[PDB]
Amino acid sequence: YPHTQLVAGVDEVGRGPLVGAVVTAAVILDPARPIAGLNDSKKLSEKRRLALYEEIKEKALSWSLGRAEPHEIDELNILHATMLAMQRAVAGLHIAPEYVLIDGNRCPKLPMPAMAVVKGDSRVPEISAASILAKVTRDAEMAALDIVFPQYGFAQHKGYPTAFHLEKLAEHGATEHHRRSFGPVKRAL
Amino acid sequence: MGHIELASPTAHIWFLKSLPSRIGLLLDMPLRDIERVLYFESYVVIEGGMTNLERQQILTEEQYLDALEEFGDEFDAKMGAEAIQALLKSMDLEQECEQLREELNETNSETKRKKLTKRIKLLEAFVQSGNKPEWMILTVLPVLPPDLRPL
RNA sequence: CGGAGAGGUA
DNA sequence: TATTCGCCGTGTACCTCTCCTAGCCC
DNA sequence: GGGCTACATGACGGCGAATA
Numbered sequence: 001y002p003h004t005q006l007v008a009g010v011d012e013v014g015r016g017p018l019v020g021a022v023v024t025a026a027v028i029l030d031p032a033r034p035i036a037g038l039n040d041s042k043k044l045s046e047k048r049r050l051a052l053y054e055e056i057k058e059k060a061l062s063w064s065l066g067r068a069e070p071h072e073i074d075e076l077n078i079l080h081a082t083m084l085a086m087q088r089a090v091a092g093l094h095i096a097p098e099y100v101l102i103d104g105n106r107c108p109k110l111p112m113p114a115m116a117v118v119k120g121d122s123r124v125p126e127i128s129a130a131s132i133l134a135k136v137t138r139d140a141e142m143a144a145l146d147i148v149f150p151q152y153g154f155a156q157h158k159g160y161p162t163a164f165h166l167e168k169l170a171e172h173g174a175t176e177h178h179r180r181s182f183g184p185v186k187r188a189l
Numbered sequence: 190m191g192h193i194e195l196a197s198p199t200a201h202i203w204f205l206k207s208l209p210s211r212i213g214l215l216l217d218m219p220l221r222d223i224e225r226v227l228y229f230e231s232y233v234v235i236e237g238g239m240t241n242l243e244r245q246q247i248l249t250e251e252q253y254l255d256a257l258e259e260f261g262d263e264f265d266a267k268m269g270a271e272a273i274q275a276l277l278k279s280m281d282l283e284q285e286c287e288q289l290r291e292e293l294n295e296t297n298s299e300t301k302r303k304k305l306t307k308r309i310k311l312l313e314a315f316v317q318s319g320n321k322p323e324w325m326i327l328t329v330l331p332v333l334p335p336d337l338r339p340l
Numbered sequence: 341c342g343g344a345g346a347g348g349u350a
Numbered sequence: 351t352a353t354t355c356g357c358c359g360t361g362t363a364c365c366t367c368t369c370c371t372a373g374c375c376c
Numbered sequence: 377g378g379g380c381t382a383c384a385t386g387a388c389g390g391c392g393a394a395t396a
Contacts, residue, residue, distance in 0.1 A: 016291040037240055042288070045238035105297060118297075160287040163316075208357080209393075220394090339342085 002113070005031075006061075008097035009126025010089055012082050012104075013134040017159030018169070018185050019152075019178050020141055021067040022082050025133035026089040027126050028097055033059040038128040040121045041135040052132045060129065064092030065137060074181040083108040089130075103127050149175060191332040198270040199327045200227055212325060214308060215315075216276065222247050227269055235272040236279050237264030245276070270326055277322040286312045 001007060012024045029035065035055055037048070044052070057063060066088025068081035076084060086108045090100055100107070100114035101124050107114040120127035139158060146155035152168045152175075159165070161184055169178070169188045178185050204211045205224070213223045225247065226233045232248040242248075242264050248256060253266070267275065289309045296302055315322070 015295075016287060039243070043243050045243075048238060104295060157284070157287075160284070162283045162287065164283075 002099045002115075004098035006095060006098040007126055008062075008090060008093060008100045009120065009124050009128070009130045010086055010100060010102045011121055011127050011131040011134055012085065013131070013138045014159065015078060015082065016161070017179070018161050018165065018182050019070070019154060019159035019175070020138070020145065021069050022073060022078065022085050023134050023138045023141075024066045024082070024085040024089040025130040025137070026062075026064050026066070026086075026093050026097075026100075027056065027060050027129040027133060028062040028093065028095055029126050029129060030059055030061045035059055035125070035129065038125045038132075040128065041131040044132070046139075049132055049136055052129075053136050056129050056133055062093045062095035062097075063129075063133060064089050064094075065133065066090070066092060070177055070179045073179050077181070079106075101127055103131065145177060190334060193330040193332060195328055195330060198274050200270050200273060201325055201327050204325045211311070212273075212277075215311060215322065216245075216280075217308070218245065223273075227273065229269055232266055232268050233272055235265050235267040235275050237266055239264035242266070274323050274326040277326065280322065282312065282316055282322075286316065 006028055008026045008028050010024060010026045012022060014020060014022045035052070038052070041049055066085045068076070068085040068088075072084065073081040083106070086102065087110065090097065090108075090110055097112055100110055100112060101120055102108070102114055102116050103120040105116045105118055107116050117124055117127060121131040122128070142154045142158045145159075146153065151172055153164060157165050161182075166184055169184060174180065174185050174188050178188075180186070180189065200212070205213075205227075210220050210223065213220045216223065222231075225231045232250070232253045234242045234244065234246045234248070236244055238244075239260060242256065248266070256266075266272075286309060289305060289312065293302065293305055293309065296305065
């Protein structure tokens with residue numbers, strides 16, 4: 001760790017999906033209220049992951065969510081839309097972090113110092129907590145969109161380009177939420 | 190031809206020691222550990238969900254002891270070919286592929302990429318192939334015609 | 341009518 | 351990257367001789 | 377009358393996935 005007390009961890013979800021925002025979270029954990037069993041959100045069962053949501057949100061000093069909508073992804077591309085999302089997440093923290101740890105190998109432009117941590121979700125509790133918040137939020141939005149657009153099955157594939165999603169995209173065309181810059185969506189349009 | 194009904198499933202040695210082990214690199218588990226759960230000298234959590242135990246972990250006789258101390262209701266843990274077959278059955282194919290696909294461009298490591306792409310090519314060839322992962326675990330044994338094995 | 345071991349001819 | 355340890359395989363066609371899985375009781 | 381148990385090492389090379 002850096003020699004600072006207010007460290008934020010940041011992670012993203014929804015890089016590869018053809019539909020919906022890229023979603024990020026930022027989390028400052030409370031050293032006095034440790035959260036047990038933080039680990040890569042993918043390795044966690046859905047029940048455990050959602051369980052963390054009632055612990056993370058309760059026990060963190062500060063957390064926030066930052067999103068980049070399909071139109072911003074289409075304008076900025078997926079890399080810069082992820083950086084924008086991340087910024088917002090960090091910018092939404094009630095408590096300003098002294099230092100920011102970002103999953104992966106690049107940092108967004110931030111007003112405070114930041115470091116990129118490769119596989120930070122598996123190594124840094126704050127990035128793990130951000131991974132969980134981002135993933136749970138994103139997965140709930142795909143379930144909400146599935147209610148409105150049941151023919152695509154967004155609840156099952158979470159907007160990823162599965163064979164089923166590509167078939168339904170060819171059959172029904174692209175929705176407004178469907179990222180219009182992605183290759184499969186361009187073809188369907 | 191004929192067949193023999195087997196009470197317990199049996200792992201196929203060809204797919205076990207193909208060098209590289211197809212099952213071993215499909216489950217993303219080392220050969221030493223995968224060859225230590227089929228012989229009942231260890232243990233493994235079969236898609237169990239507890240505070241500590243996650244989907245895949247090779248517990249030893251002593252680790253299982255303090256595992257089964259207080260809890261032991263939801264998270265299960267089988268041992269051998271049955272557990273391996275259930276793991277192969279209860280793993281997604283299209284979802285896993287997508288995830289791996291993405292982690293291919295972001296990842297900057299060289300060796301990792303090679304190991305990642307070598308995994309994803311097998312996953313794709315399987316997905317266009319008309320085979321199922323659980324068929325690699327033998328359950329019914331055919332027998333050779335008697336004339337081809339004369340007395 | 342199958343499989344091993346020993347020796348020999350190009 | 352170089353070192354270790356795994357298995358991969360290592361020509362072909364003929365001729366002669368001898369020698370091969372057994373085990374439980376009212 | 378019935379069912380019933382299954383000891384080796386002198387190996388020359390190279391490649392490749394496993395580690396050091």
